[PDB]
Amino acid sequence: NQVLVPNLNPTPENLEVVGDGFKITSSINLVGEEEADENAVNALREFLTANNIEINSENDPNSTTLIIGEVDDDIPELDEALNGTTAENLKEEGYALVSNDGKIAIEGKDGDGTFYGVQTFKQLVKESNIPEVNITDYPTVSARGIVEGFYGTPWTHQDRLDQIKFYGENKLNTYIYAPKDDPYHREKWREPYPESEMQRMQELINASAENKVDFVFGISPGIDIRFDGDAGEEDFNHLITKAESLYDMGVRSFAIYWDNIQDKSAAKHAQVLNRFNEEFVKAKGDVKPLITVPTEYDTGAMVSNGQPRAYTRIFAETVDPSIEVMWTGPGVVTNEIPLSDAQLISGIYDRNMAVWWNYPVTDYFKGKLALGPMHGLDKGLNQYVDFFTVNPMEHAELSKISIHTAADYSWNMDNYDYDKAWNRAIDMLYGDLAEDMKVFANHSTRMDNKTWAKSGREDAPELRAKMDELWNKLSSKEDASALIEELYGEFARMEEACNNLKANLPEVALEECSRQLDELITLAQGDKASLDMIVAQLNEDTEAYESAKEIAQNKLNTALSSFAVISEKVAQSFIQEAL
Amino acid sequence: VPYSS
Ligand SMILES: *[C@@H]1O[C@H](CO)[C@@H](O)[C@H](O)[C@H]1NC(C)=O
């Protein structure tokens, strides 16, 4: 009978079911494709082909009709199909979508908008069934996406192309190219890319345009750049030459980065930025605002007693208002960006800020996977932030979980529920394996190197609660056998899920997390022996206690010398507590 | 150092 609205990501701002839904016919009437966004139509064409829906040559009135276009197209048949709903009054990138009575209309506020309308369309359709809905939709934050700016092995060409498809499909519109260990990015920033790297860039730029992603070409010259006299000219001209050869392949966004360098010449940094902004960005006329990150880029390094440090004050005083400025929040890697930290930094800079969010990056603690949702970022952040990017792992595939939630948070910020988003991320990504992937991933959300880097939702918090309850019940001598049995089940379940993931994950995921799958299976076995210890102590069975103690020490020993790190404060720490 | 410390 009725067609339910499937999982959608991001969450559309306004959605109403207006009917029972309908099945889309074998072949459809497509209207508006001549004037509609070229990329939206290609996206739509691929989806139709992938789902064996043909486009009729000649209108057949017995077939589903799909109308598509932007506000600024003169197509009356579209305005008739929206039934008084419009994208005219929406912010840029917004769209309206209506399916009723065998018609699907999509109207983008602009081309980006029409492409995004197609994305939502694609998510709504299952086995030819679409619900009947009226949608108007638009992003909270106008720049949303990813900065590949981590240390360690950069993503491959194949990784990047696949990521860019993934951004498109989740309405992320920004990808900043800035890998720390690309030599031509940083170590040898003056040197041109060779012919073949330039060909790989071209493919990246093309795929970005195809997927409505702003490819941002970053460069980090702060290691050895000269600011004064003829050397300053020469080194500035090296920036221009480099940026120009990416402009010449189609790049329209640029970033100059000053993070993690010894030189703290604020004014000279800001002068390089302003000169480039005048001589390059504005001169070109079709280039987006310049992006930067200052040498002090977290609040702790930027601010001292409510008042900016020397560097920051001078940088902010000099850096042209049009330039986007990124900061990571209260620390490099931190639990939170409270609304007040944003207010503070946006105060000093006197502009809306850009966030460089260092999660799920794991270059500072490579043994663990960061597989949680966006967590700790205030839902009113849009008031001081208009540009949002996450720094992912050197593992592109598994970064997808966290990035999926980044798409939800930055598109529809105030509706964002990290737990619901996290569940949706895994459901949409893992299909048949979702429920198991959740069991595993649930243990791998918290990042903590025990010093400066701490971020993420806590590892399996419900399980910790039960573990904590068990210790309370034992020390106050209450009957724990209901909890005990419950706990055997959870540990068994961790083992069963992990063994199923190992057998069934496709290679692309499996090769990113197989060591951590072994780790969690190990720990689950040690948690089980840990309980066998508890029970033997209760039953005064020394034989059975010494025997479970050995097993529990043998699993803990394996985990402690593992490169893989998982569930430190939950599965791991339970064995330590029992010992 | 291959991280931000
Ligand atoms: C420092 O922090 C992260 C984590 O190590 C690193 O990936 C990044 O390149 C550095 N810069 C910023 C601005 O976070």
Numbering used by the authors:
A (entry chain A): 39 to 617
B (entry chain T): 392 to 396
Task: Show me the paper's own sentences about this structure.
Reversible protein O-GlcNAcylation is achieved by the action of two enzymes, O-GlcNAc transferase (OGT) and O-GlcNAcase (OGA). Although it is unclear whether CpOGA is a physiological OGA, it shows significant in vitro O-GlcNAcase activity on O-GlcNAc proteins in lysates from human cell lines and possesses a putative substrate-binding groove conserved with hOGA (Rao et al., 2006; Schimpl et al., 2010). We report the molecular details of the interaction of a bacterial O-GlcNAcase homolog with three different synthetic glycopeptides derived from characterized O-GlcNAc sites in the human proteome. In addition to extensive contacts with the sugar, O-GlcNAcase recognizes the peptide backbone through hydrophobic interactions and intramolecular hydrogen bonds, while avoiding interactions with the glycopeptide side chains.
Here we report that CpOGA, like hOGA (Schimpl et al., 2010), possesses activity toward synthetic glycopeptides derived from validated O-GlcNAc sites in the human proteome, namely p53 (Ser149 [Yang et al., 2006]), TAK1-binding protein 1 (TAB1, Ser395 [Schimpl et al., 2010]), and hOGA itself (Ser405 [Lazarus et al., 2006]). To investigate the molecular basis of this substrate specificity, we exploited the catalytic acid mutant of CpOGA, D298N, which is inactive yet unaffected in its ability to bind substrate (Rao et al., 2006). We generated an alternative CpOGA crystal form with a highly accessible active site and determined the structures of CpOGA D298N in complex with the p53-, TAB1-, and hOGA-derived O-GlcNAc peptides. The O-GlcNAc sugar occupies the same position in all three structures (maximum atomic shift of 0.2 Å). Strikingly, the backbones of all three glycopeptides run in the same direction, together defining the −4 through +3 subsites, and adopt similar conformations near the O-GlcNAc site (maximum Cα shift of 1.8 Å for the −2 to +1 subsites). All three glycopeptides adopt a “V-shaped” conformation that allows the sugar to penetrate the OGA active site. Interestingly, for two of the peptides, this conformation appears to be stabilized by intramolecular hydrogen bonds. For the p53-derived glycopeptide, a hydrogen bond is observed between the aspartic acid in the −1 subsite and the threonine in the +1 subsite. Such intramolecular interactions may stabilize the OGA-bound conformation of these glycopeptides, explaining the significantly lower Kms compared to the TAB1-derived peptide. We tested this hypothesis by designing glycopeptide sequences that either disrupted (in case of the p53-derived peptide) or introduced (in case of the TAB1-derived peptide) such intramolecular interactions. Indeed, introducing a hydrogen bond acceptor in the TAB1 peptide leads to a 5-fold decrease in Km for hOGA, whereas disrupting the hydrogen bond in the p53-derived peptide, either by removing the hydrogen bond donor or acceptor, leads to an 85-fold increase in Km.
